[PDB]
Amino acid sequence: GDWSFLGNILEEVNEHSTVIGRVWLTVLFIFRILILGTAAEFVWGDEQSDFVCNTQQPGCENVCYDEAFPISHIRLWVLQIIFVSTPSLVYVGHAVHHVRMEEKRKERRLEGTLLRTYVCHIIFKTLFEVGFIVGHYFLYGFRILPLYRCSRWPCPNVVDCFVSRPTEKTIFILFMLSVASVSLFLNILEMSHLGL
Amino acid sequence: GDWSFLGNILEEVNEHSTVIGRVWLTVLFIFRILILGTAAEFVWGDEQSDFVCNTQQPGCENVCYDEAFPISHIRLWVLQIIFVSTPSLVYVGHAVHHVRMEEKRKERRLEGTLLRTYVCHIIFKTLFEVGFIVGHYFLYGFRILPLYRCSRWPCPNVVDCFVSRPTEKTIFILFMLSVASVSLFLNILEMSHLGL
Amino acid sequence: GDWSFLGNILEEVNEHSTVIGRVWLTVLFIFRILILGTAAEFVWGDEQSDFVCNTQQPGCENVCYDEAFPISHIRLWVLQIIFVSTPSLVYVGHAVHHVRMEEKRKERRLEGTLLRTYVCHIIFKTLFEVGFIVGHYFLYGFRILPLYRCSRWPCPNVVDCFVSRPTEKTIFILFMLSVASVSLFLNILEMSHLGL
Amino acid sequence: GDWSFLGNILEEVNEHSTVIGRVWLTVLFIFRILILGTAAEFVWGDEQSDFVCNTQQPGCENVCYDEAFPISHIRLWVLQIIFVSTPSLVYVGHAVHHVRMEEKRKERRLEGTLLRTYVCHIIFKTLFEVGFIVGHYFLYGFRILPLYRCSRWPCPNVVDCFVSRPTEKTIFILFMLSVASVSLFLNILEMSHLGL
Amino acid sequence: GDWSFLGNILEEVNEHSTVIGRVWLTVLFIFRILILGTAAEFVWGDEQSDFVCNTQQPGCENVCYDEAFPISHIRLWVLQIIFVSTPSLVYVGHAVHHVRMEEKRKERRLEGTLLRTYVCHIIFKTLFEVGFIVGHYFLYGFRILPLYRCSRWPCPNVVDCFVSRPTEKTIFILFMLSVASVSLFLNILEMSHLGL
Amino acid sequence: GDWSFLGNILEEVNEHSTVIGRVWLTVLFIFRILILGTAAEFVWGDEQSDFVCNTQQPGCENVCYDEAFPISHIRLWVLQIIFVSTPSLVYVGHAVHHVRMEEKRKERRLEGTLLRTYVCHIIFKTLFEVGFIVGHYFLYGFRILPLYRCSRWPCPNVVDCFVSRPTEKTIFILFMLSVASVSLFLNILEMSHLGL
């Protein structure tokens, strides 16, 4: 996973953001992207290969892994990162559009419409963070148990399947939840600081 | 997969495109290339290794995977990305050719023929996006089912084969479809904005 | 596969080539190198590991894969890329040699001998492209069939072996053939444009 | 694992730190990050794949690996690196915030509040290092024994499981402990040097 | 395999070498290093994993692979590349040492001792190339046959072992031999051009 | 393994070292780091996966590999590289500290204390090189034999285990020993050149 493109564009908008937005962005780079690439990706690497079911039924392990894990937590966190970063991109686009307009108009900072855009970007970041948190909760909760019982066809009756590294995965699930909540708190502080 | 070459050339044509073309390009980099490399590629990594068929027939799994998946979705999205990016390259080539001509002629922006070229590039992008969407639909639809039934020789009669990660794959199929449709809408907005 | 060295040297000779040579080079970077690294390499990744033969004979699968695939298509395309790029390197070497000579002589563009060299480079590119196309045809044709029948010792009598991903491989074989033919047409256009 | 982001930001704060802080940072880069990526990661690569248990019970190896290794040492060292680096980031943020304020105020080094912040950053680094050391001790100690006995369900009675590379892992555990303790000593020297 | 260090230093000595030395260096980068990383390394990737012997004897395949392939061709070509590049490094060191001396002496091109050093560097390159060619011949010849017969203990009597991809390996062996011989011819031309 | 950090810092101290220290550093980059990453790492890649023992005893192969190879040669060479490079870092730190002091004092080369530091750095490099050589000898000698006999529990009685690629490993062991000894000779020459 090469995050160079997103990185370069978000460090562009480091220069154009509040101090609390610079903290938010540093958190995104260090506690989410870096963790994902240096730790979480390896934890989930053998998610299906080490998933085992007590059965001689061909196909059962496939369908039971798929039912237990409709989308891997790591893919969900990738999507979360991209969607929470998208409003920053929108804002920096608006800002650069104004810089190029000012240059052109001459040929021919957080005030006015850039403030409304910044506040909206904060709002959307907050809502997307909340949405991904809630979705994670309803999909998986915040704990992976070792045992998963499966009755999906072709599995005969109910079969016992065993998850890879449930405890390490639980630790990283809770870590990512905490990081997301810190991000939410930072966004709240941004709104308060702007208001006051 | 190293997209550095294409990246550098398309960020060259960031400078020479409309604001809506800059949004289109950002979408290409973040929601297509980045997703493909940080998420989709890993989802499809074990596509054949975890594809299983209920048979003792040598060769059957090979032919049944090949019949179910004549071309992996990820390869199809790579091709789509390159073909939808090709008209941008043509346009930037025309533009740089005019810049070098102007420099030479001196030794010796979206107006005139560059406008016709830009509009044609938008048209071709739209048509290629539509073509890849339609091709995806006819080849696979927008859902991967866990079970695939196969009667290709050497398989005896009909055999039941089971796909790897059908649900996660379905999620990413729909995600990529939505991103492609957003790109189409952006191209339509480009044509409208130019007209008006 | 790291193509950085070749890339840097061929983007050096972007500056010193015709507009049609810049199109040829862009095609080389995007439709050949990029495809190879982002798509084809993964398609052929399990070429021998998923090659299966219906036999209990030790050694047979090894010799039958080797007879079916004396050289993988991807290695052949790597060689093709390097050989079709070599004349460009020769030409840019001649050109830079003249630039350094002019600088020296001062201490002490496509005209003259650089034109003869450019035309010769086009000729050699054309001949190498044709040669690799013809060699591909005679070695493999343009279709990989699922079944390969093998009688190489130690295989007893004739054994049935099954190829990995024959259809996807056929798609990429035809795609690379088309890209090579486009390159040929571009070289022809270069010669015509120079003549006229 | 790509540490480029963190690296660039910590080499930013090389310029703004004491000589002993530059030694601490060099130790972080060379003896922790570099060791982790060039050595430790490969030692732990086959941690679960080569973990074996003497049993015919489906699921037992999964639960026994998970009980023996709730979190891999390498993931724990990644977290440790990030948390001990976080206060440096806070300090450099404060410092750069003051530099940008001074620039602005003009439009309109370790003294004052930057000294309090630097001392606090040292304190937090020390406490986090101590906490990770203590946590490592209580979780695993400083030795990995080859044999792990496991009675977690579904394992019948007590089963004997065998760890991959216990001795090499013990060597690297002790090496990382020593490096952490050197870092602690460096922080103590920082506080003393500032006081005197 | 990261050749960045060697690359940067040899492109330093591009600037300080003859035109024929620039051709030699381009050949080294494109036809040896690039081939090795984009093609040969993958051909030899499954050298031991796909090496099979017709035996039920534990250990036999290990000892028979080791006897057949005391050193993989790819490792031998890596060593060859480094040793044939070493004299270039010596020469560029001498040249830069003279440049820094001239700068110093001021504070306080291929003529004289730099010519003797250049000629010696050519001589050593030639001798090392010849030595690696001869060593390759005596160790393996220039053909890998599919069958290798092995009588090394613990193998009982003589066992038949089968090599992975003998034909593709033979093609690349001959290709690398030809590239080495081209390098030799280039060195001879260097000596002649200097003499005349 | 990413050596970029160490590389950049050691090429910083290229500028501040003797000619013999520049040779030592080039040897470190080319004959140790580059060999390790382009050759040795692949030779040792299947060290445990291809290690086989003639036994039906669960756990025996694990404990016997661990007893035969308490620390892989490649990890030992990584540690050696870092420790022999550490004194260079100390010296360059002292030198840069003096450069920044001189700049400051103005606001307000190998002579004096920098000579003592340089000599001490040479001494420590020599001692660490000798120590790693001696440790290698006592741990493994300079030859890996194919057969390793093991009586570690749970292995019943004495079992015969077979090492992966003993001959290639022996070649690289001797190569690295020779490179280390060349480094020692270079350090001796440094001391002599400084004395005379």
Numbering used by the authors:
A (entry chain B), B (entry chain C), C (entry chain D), D (entry chain A), E (entry chain E), F (entry chain F): 2 to 109, 149 to 236
Q: Can you quote the paper on this entry?
A:
The connexins are a family of transmembrane proteins (21 isoforms in human) that form intercellular channels for cell-to-cell communication.
However, the significant enhancement in resolution allowed for a detailed refinement of side chain conformations and notable improvement in precision at functional sites, including the NTH domain and the EC1/2 docking sites. A bouquet of 15 ordered lipid acyl chains is held in place by each of the 12 connexin subunits, which appear to buttress the channel assembly by filling a cavity formed at the lateral subunit interfaces (blue). Pore-bound waters localize to regions of the EC1 domain and TM1 parahelix, and mediate an extensive network of h-bonding interactions, involving D42, F43 (π-bonding), E48, Q49, N63, and R76 in Cx50 (positions 42 and 43 are Glu in Cx46), and several protein backbone interactions. A cluster of four waters are buried within the EC1/2 domains coordinated by residues D47, E48, Y66, F70 (π bonding), S73, S204/S192, and K209/K197 in Cx50/46.
